[PDB]
Amino acid sequence: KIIVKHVTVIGGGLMGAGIAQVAAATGHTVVLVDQTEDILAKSKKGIEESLRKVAKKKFAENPKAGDEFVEKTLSTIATSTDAASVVHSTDLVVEAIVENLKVKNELFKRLDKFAAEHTIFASNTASLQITSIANATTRQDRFAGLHFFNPVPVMKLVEVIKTPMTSQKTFESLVDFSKALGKHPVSCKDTPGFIVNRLLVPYLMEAIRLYERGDASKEDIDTAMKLGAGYPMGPFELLDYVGLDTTKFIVDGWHEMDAENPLHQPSPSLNKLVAENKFGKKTGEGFYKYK
């Protein structure tokens, strides 16, 4: 069983920059990867920006301490535009790029060739099939899903996804990596939505349906779930938070895999806004208007 020390993170976006941040903070040598030096540049600036916010509150007393913390972490995150140039000596690759299967498969098929023999490949994919992406390579026993949640620096959960071919050796290492990252790992078969989303997304859709059916206003449904179920955010607040686009995307997927299914029936209200570009907190408006 190998102990992850060098981690290559492919995708300097929302989920990837977060993943690079935690790994560096927790003592892993990291190489962040994205299509351009400009994009990379911006990502590290965001990782830095996120780090100081963590510094000035983890070291509110001693600013210098917080500075050191920031500089050291940021300094153990290198940046490259071609993952193939660094994976030959990395222990784990965590992929977090476009949620497109063809692109991923193309990515891994290539990396498969450069990466050392012990290197493990993990996809932070939210809706695709891990087993699929895994089959674009000849290294499935070393392939699995390592699903994090936004925002990564804060969310403590991480789902370790096991394809039928992933090996125990590979699994345990991914669990130990998760624990090393300071997160709490949990196991789940390679099934759509894994756990969190499989149980969360259908819930939100139902909320939109009760609203659409005119059974209650959004404001009252949100209140009801916050006060009567103890949820942090009402379903509509949560929808605007995770992104209407993101949701719509995932549900079209599940619907398309099984159209006769009523749980995945589309949503006019959701569709209109996705159309009107109102994506939620992202764009400054979703179901609710934001500053």
Ligand X SMILES: NC(=O)c1ccc[n+]([C@@H]2O[C@H](COP(=O)([O-])OP(=O)(O)OC[C@H]3O[C@@H](n4cnc5c(N)ncnc54)[C@H](O)[C@@H]3O)[C@@H](O)[C@H]2O)c1
Which chain residues interact with a second copy by CB under 8 A? 149, 155-157, 159, 184, 186-189, 191, 195-196, 198-200, 202-203, 206-207, 210, 213-217, 220-221, 223-225, 227-232, 235, 261-263
CB < 8 Å & 24+ apart, contacts of 174-181:
174/92, 174/120, 174/122, 174/144, 174/146, 176/1, 176/3, 176/4, 177/4, 177/7, 177/92, 177/146, 178/146, 180/4, 180/26, 180/27, 180/28, 181/22, 181/23, 181/26, 181/28
How distant, in Å, are the alpha carbons of 10, 192, 215 from that of 98? 10, 17, 37
> 70: which 2 tokens?
């920031």
- Residue 13 found at the interface with ligand X (CB under 6 A): yes
Contacting ligand X within 17-56 (CB under 6 A): 33-35, 39
Inter-residue contact 162 to 135 (CB < 8 Å): no
Nearer to a second copy, 26 or 36 (CB): 26
Q: Which option in ligand X, a second copy, none does residue 199 bind, with CB closer than 5 to 8 A by kind? A: a second copy
Task: Report which DSSP code applies to 215.
Answer: S
Q: Give how many residues touch ligand X by CB under 6 A.
A: 25
Least distance in angstroms from the C-beta of 110 to ligand X: 9
Q: How far is CA 225 from CA 1, 34, 220, 233, in A?
A: 44, 39, 9, 8
65/154 with CB nearer a second copy: 154
Task: Name the residue nearer to a second copy (CB basis): 13 or 192.
Answer: 192
**Interface pick for ligand X out of 4, 7, 8, 16 (rule CB under 6 A):** 16
> Which of ligand X, a second copy, none binds 98 (CB below 5-8 Å, type-dependent)?
ligand X
Q: Which of a second copy, ligand X, none lies near 10, with the C-beta cut-off 5 to 8 A by kind?
A: ligand X
CB nearer a second copy, residue 107 or residue 201: 201
| Binding stretches for ligand X (CB under 6 A) | 10-16, 33-35, 39, 96-99, 103, 107, 124-126, 147, 149-150, 242, 246
